[PDB]
Write a protein that binds this ligand. Structure first.
Ligand SMILES: Nc1ncnc2c1ncn2[C@@H]1O[C@H](COP(=O)(O)OP(=O)(O)O)[C@@H](O)[C@H]1O
Ligand code: ALF
Ligand SMILES: [Mg+2]
Ligand SMILES: [Zn+2]
Length: 653
RNA sequence: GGUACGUACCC
RNA sequence: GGUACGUACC
């Protein structure tokens, strides 16, 4: 059953050594890990395995395709975010021999204050960490492993054996041999690795496209942007319309205008960001997709707003007409059409990877409206993860699974997917991967290519000629080789030198964490919460103090002041999510009573309703400065945990 | 919707 | 120090 190379790769794990199994994409690391799990559980009494993954869909895949075979002798349980609300994790885990979950499910249990929810690392004898190259920086995998290292270095006994699985440790952005080796050693230190274990036809093509000869739609948007910038009456405004740098600079101006309460500048900047978004969409997909971006924004008075509405209305019909003209088609789409026409003339089974969820939806719509493809028997669908925004909702575990199951045997034969499916997904019949204008690291490149499991697969890079994306793809190909050299060098290192380096790196990691925690705490304690005032980002009115805020589940920032209700208005009916939570559900959206700016949403927490505030909708004012924050975790005053008991007691008075 | 982190980009 | 996107958790 197991191939020779699978047996070879797991020999250290079978002996109890912490290891990383480094085998190519599609080589069968999962089955190898199942064998380790079986022998681990057979080889002692009372063992318990946790299998950690990084994407929701991989929980069911690993269970149904691989780990379920253990149920002839052992209890195997799977948990994701979608199923979380039903059982206490600690109960479920402790009743199982093997638990399979996304890593943050385990992390939440490790951090829990509730006896029934909580688990310790010492409740497991083996941790299998899939896609273990993510065990870096402040990713969840590394939060879990840093706690392991803190416990190890303090002398804790009974920590689990570690089995990491990866095709691609990467080079961590390093382009030198010295740097790449250091990166490999860092990953080994993070995972407490004793040995990196390894073993002892697809074609790649660059499908390059040219810039559009004529782009009257884009040209008109740039003309409008210039008009809006003239209206702002400001020198030194950015001119580089239709770029990520422009986006950054205009949002930075928007944030500065919020902090200084310059309403006209802030609103103009907010609109300019939408025109820039439209230019980026126009470059990626169809003109009409870009038009719909702007039309939706203006469909959803003040002199600045009147100017901006009029400006759009004056150009709307010309823009829509241009967007219907085939003469100005996006060459990226012309190229994609050529690829699909060549390869889907039922035979093929493909994934086209795009950056954004909205792009994936737009590509499906394009496909469905393209005469030249209607006739090739293409049955396509979008696959995204559970990310969400106003631009684009996500997909639930169940929705993702439906698409995946139909794609597996060809009920669907083409997916437009985000990076949700770049790693781990196993579709043996997938024989084509197109990467549509992506800028990624070498890991994502190797992984996404690897979704084409079939013999005689093809991998297409569809990107603009002479672009940074093409340069980065070429560089990344070289970095894969560099990575391989570096891993072999680490594998060949004298044991004494390796062990000493690992020691050094683990020590550095645990010391560096302490210093970071101290710095974060110092920042958090700078101001008394009574001295911090929140202002509406839109109208600048004061609305509460820092002392009014509490956290729920260390995430949701509620205002507990009984008179805050006079400052916000309930602005919708009840919100519904797909996922249900243990102690609360959403109520309605809330907005500033003075200007209708979105602020957050109600939480119905047991028998009370509390308003949750989104940090991005405020300017935070302290005695020292006024600042727009993107994250609650960096504010300069302390916030206490919500106490439901204390809250109910104080309200009864 | 809320939160965090990763990747890309700029400083 | 920021921007965008993505995923994950809630
Ligand atoms: N020894 C084997 N014989 C036949 N098929 C195998 C063997 N080991 C694994 N497989 C299959 O190989 C495919 C790729 O395995 P997977 O574990 O997803 O690869 P990866 O190493 O990227 O995790 C799966 O369909 C799996 O069932
Ligand atoms: F390396 Al894989 F699925 F784990 F392609
Ligand atoms: Mg895998
Ligand atoms: Zn307001």
């Amino acid at each position: 059953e197991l191939h020779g190379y699978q047996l070879e790769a797991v020999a250290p794990a079978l002996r109890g050594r912490n290891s990383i199994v480094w085998l190519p994409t599609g080589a069968g690391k999962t089955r190898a890990a199942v064998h380790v799990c079986r022998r681990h559980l057979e080889g002692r009494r009372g063992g318990r395995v946790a299998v950690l993954v990084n994407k929701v869909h991989l929980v069911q895949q690993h269970l149904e395709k691989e780990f379920h075979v253990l149920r002839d002798a052992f209890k195997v349980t799977a948990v994701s975010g979608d199923s979380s609300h039903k059982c206490f994790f600690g109960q479920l885990a402790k009743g199982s021999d093997v638990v399979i979950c996304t890593a943050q499910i385990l992390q939440n249990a490790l951090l829990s204050g509730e006896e029934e929810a909580r688990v310790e690392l010492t409740d497991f004898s083996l941790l299998v960490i899939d896609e273990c190259h993510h065990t870096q920086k402040e990713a969840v995998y590394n939060k879990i492993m840093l706690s392991y290292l803190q416990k190890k270095l303090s002398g804790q006994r009974d920590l689990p054996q570690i089995l990491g699985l990866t095709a691609s440790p990467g080079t961590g952005g390093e382009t030198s041999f010295e740097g790449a080796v250091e990166h490999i050693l860092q990953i080994c230190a993070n995972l407490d690795t004793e040995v990196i274990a390894s073993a002892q036809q697809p074609t790649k093509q660059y499908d390059l496209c040219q810039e559009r000869e004529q782009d009257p739609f884009g040209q008109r948007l740039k003309k409008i942007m210039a008009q809006i910038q003239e209206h702002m009456e400001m020198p030194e405004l950015p001119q580089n319309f239709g770029t990520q740098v422009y986006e950054q600079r205009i949002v930075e101006l928007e944030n500065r205008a919020a902090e200084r309460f310059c309403r006209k500048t802030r609103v103009c900047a907010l609109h300019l960001r939408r025109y820039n978004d439209a230019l980026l969409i126009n470059d990626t997909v169809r003109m009409m997709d870009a038009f719909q971006c702007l039309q939706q924004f203006y469909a959803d008075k003040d002199p600045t707003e009147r100017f901006l509405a009029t400006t759009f209305e004056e150009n709307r019909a010309t823009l829509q007409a241009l967007a219907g003209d085939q003469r100005y088609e996006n060459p990226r789409l012309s190229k994609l059409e050529e690829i699909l026409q060549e390869h889907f003339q039922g035979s093929s089974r493909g994934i086209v990877f795009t950056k954004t969820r909205q792009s994936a939806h737009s590509l499906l719509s394009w496909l469905q409206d393209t005469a030249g493809l209607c006739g090739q028997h293409i049955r396509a669908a979008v696959l995204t993860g559970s990310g969400h925004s106003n631009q684009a909702k996500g997909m639930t575990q169940n929705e993702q699974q439906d698409v995946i199951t139909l794609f597996r045997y060809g009920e669907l034969n083409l997916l437009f997917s985000t990076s949700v499916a770049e790693e781990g997904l196993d579709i043996p019949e997938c024989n084509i991967v197109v990467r549509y204008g992506l800028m990624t690291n070498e890991i994502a490149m190797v992984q996404a290519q690897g979704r084409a499991r079939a013999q005689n697969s093809m991998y297409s890079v569809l990107a603009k000629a002479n672009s940074r994306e093409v340069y980065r793809e070429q560089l990344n190909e070289s970095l894969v080789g560099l990575m391989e050299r570096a891993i072999r060098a680490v594998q060949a290192m004298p044991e004494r030198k390796y062990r000493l380096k690992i020691v050094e790196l683990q020590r550095n990691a645990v010391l560096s964490w302490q210093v970071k925690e101290a710095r974060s705490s110092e920042r958090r304690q700078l101001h008394d919460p009574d001295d911090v005032y929140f202002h509406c980002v839109n109208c600048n009115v004061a609305v509460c103090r820092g002392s009014d805020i509490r956290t729920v589940e260390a995430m949701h920032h509620v205002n507990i002041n009984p008179n805050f209700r006079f400052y916000y208005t309930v602005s919708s009916g009840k919100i519904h999510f797909e996922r249900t939570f243990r102690d609360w559900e959403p109520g309605c959206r809330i907005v500033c009573s003075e200007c209708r700016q979105e602020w957050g949403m109600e939480m119905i927490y047991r028998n009370v309703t509390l308003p949750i505030l989104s940090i991005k909708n405020f300017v935070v004012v302290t005695p020292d400065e006024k600042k727009k924050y993107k994250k609650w975790s960096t504010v300069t005053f302390p916030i206490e945990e919500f106490s439901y008991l204390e809250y109910c007691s104080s309200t009864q008075d």
